[PDB]
Structure formats: C-alpha cells, structure tokens
C-alpha cells in the first residue's frame, strides 16, 4: 500500500440536479489507486449531507430525497475515496452542487378573499383595490386577470399592478362577488385564485 486514491483531475466540480426528485443522478466521480489487489480497490463515501445524497460503488451520486430549491439551492458536498488496505488511505474531493428550479408553485394571493366597500357614487375610473400574488419559483412574472365574464362590463383589472378600477358608475346588478386569477406568464402550474367581493354603500 504505497499510495492513496487519487481522483481524476478534470472531473466536473460544478454539478446540477433538478429539484423535487429523489433517486436523481447528480454526477459521477472516479478515483484510481495504482496498487495491486486490495490496496488498489477504491470505496466511496460522503463526508456530509448524508441524509440528502448517497454515493454508489462506482462513484455515482444520487439524491436520497427530494431537494427543494425554494428551501436551499446549493450544497458543498464532500466525497471520500478510501482504499481497501489494512491501514486504509483516504482522499477527498469537494463538489459544488446547484439545485435547479422547476415550476412547482402557483402564484399565491395575499388574501383568499378580498372584500372592499365602495360608495355608490364612486367615479368611473377610480382604482379602489389592489390585489397581489407572489410566485416563489425562479424568474416568475405574475400577471392578473378577471376570470368571471359577468363583471367585465363593471371592473377592469390591470394585468401587471393588480389594480382594480371601476368602468361605469354603480347602480343595480348590494354586493358583487367574482374570481380573479394570477398566473406565471411562462409557467406551467395552475393559476392562483382569489375571490373579490365589492360591497356598495347605499
């Protein structure tokens, strides 16, 4: 047993794995040990994050659990190569793991139910309520729209700001309830939904 395991010098150190997948392949390392028999046989282990990653006998690394990018997106993973000698010799490598984002969150409204009380003579053009939804995924841009067709003659919803404005003065349709949506313009998850109730003071 003249020497330790040495990792291949040009193994990638920056590895990326998609969030929300257990048993996902992260990458593969290799350490060689130019020695005869059991002094030349390399075994792999991890020095940290053992509940989150595992390594196989050929140096392939997999997630043990679903990673959540929204909770943490980076791991400095220590890989250990040990030979089979009676006095074992070890070497280590740090890998820098990046967790990649998927669209797994719909926009979430600040309120499940917005309620607003307006004066009967509120002028046409008044913006009287702002709604707001947040999307925790990476690069998301939230846009707003009114789902319910039957109020589209009464109110307009600004697609960027979420400001709700009056199109015509109020008379007899003393409340009106409808659904608003918030969606990631380039996302794939469903829209977030919230109810809006407008109450007219007589």
Buried b (16+ CB within 10 A) or exposed e, 170-200: beeeeebebebbbbbeebebebbbbebebeb
Output 1 or 60, the one with its CB closest to Ca ion. Answer: 1
The minimum distance between CB 139 and Ca ion, in angstroms, equals 9
Q: Per rule CB under 5 A, is residue 195 in the interface with Ca ion?
A: no
Here the tokens at position 81 are: 């190569």
Q: Per rule CB under 5 A, is residue 181 in the interface with Ca ion?
A: no
Among 15, 27, 59, 83, binds Ca ion (CB under 5 A): 83
The minimum distance between CB 99 and Ca ion, in angstroms, equals 9
Q: Which stretch binds Ca ion (CB under 5 A): 46-54, 63-71, 74-82, 154-162?
A: 63-71
Q: Per rule CB under 5 A, is residue 68 in the interface with Ca ion?
A: yes
Here the tokens at position 90 are: 């070890």
Name, in order, each residue with C-beta under 8 angstroms of 200's C-beta and a sequence gap of 6 or more.
117, 118, 119, 120, 170, 174, 175
Output 141 or 197, the one with its CB closest to Ca ion. Answer: 141
For residue 138, give the nearest of 197, 189, 86, 196 by alpha carbon.
189
Say which DSSP state 190 is in.
Answer: P
Residues in contact with Ca ion, shown as a per-residue x/- string from 147 to 166 under the rule CB under 5 A:
--------------------
Task: Name the closest residue to Ca ion (Cβ).
Answer: 137
Q: State how far the Cα of 163 lies from the Cα of 156, in Å rounded to an integer.
A: 8
Q: Per rule CB under 5 A, is residue 1 in the interface with Ca ion?
A: yes
The minimum distance between CB 5 and Ca ion, in angstroms, equals 7
Q: Which stretch binds Ca ion (CB under 5 A): 9-17, 24-32, 38-46, 59-67?
A: 38-46
Q: State how far the Cα of 121 lies from the Cα of 136, in Å rounded to an integer.
A: 39
Task: Specify whether the CB–CB gap between 144 and 133 falls below 8 A.
Answer: yes
Q: Per rule CB under 5 A, is residue 187 in the interface with Ca ion?
A: yes
Q: Per rule CB under 5 A, is residue 135 in the interface with Ca ion?
A: yes
Please give the helix or strand (H or E) that residue 125 lies within, else none: none
Binding interface with Ca ion (CB under 5 A): 1, 33, 35, 39, 68-70, 83, 101, 103-105, 135, 137, 140, 184, 187, 189
């Amino acid at each position: 047993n003249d020497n330790a395991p040495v990792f291949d010098p040009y193994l990638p150190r920056n590895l990326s794995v998609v969030e929300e997948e257990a048993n996902a392949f992260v990458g593969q390392v290799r350490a060689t040990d130019p020695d005869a028999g059991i002094n030349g046989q390399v075994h792999y282990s991890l020095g940290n994050f053992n509940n989150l990653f595992r390594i196989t006998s050929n140096g392939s690394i997999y997630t043990a659990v679903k990673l959540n990018r929204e909770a943490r997106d980076h791991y400095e993973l220590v890989v250990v190569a040990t030979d089979g000698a009676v006095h074992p010799r070890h070497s280590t490598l740090t890998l820098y793991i990046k967790v990649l984002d998927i669209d797994d969150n719909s926009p979430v409204f600040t309120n499940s139910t917005y309620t607003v009380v307006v004066e009967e003579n509120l002028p046409a053009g008044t913006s009287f309520l702002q709604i707001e939804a947040k999307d925790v995924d990476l690069g998301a841009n939230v846009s707003y729209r009114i789902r319910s067709p039957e109020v589209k003659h009464l109110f307009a919803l600004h697609p960027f700001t979420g400001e709700l404005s009056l199109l015509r003065s109020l008379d007899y349709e003393a409340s009106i309830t409808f659904l608003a949506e918030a969606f990631d313009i380039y996302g794939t998850m469903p829209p977030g939904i919230a109810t809006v109730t407008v109450i007219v003071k007589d």
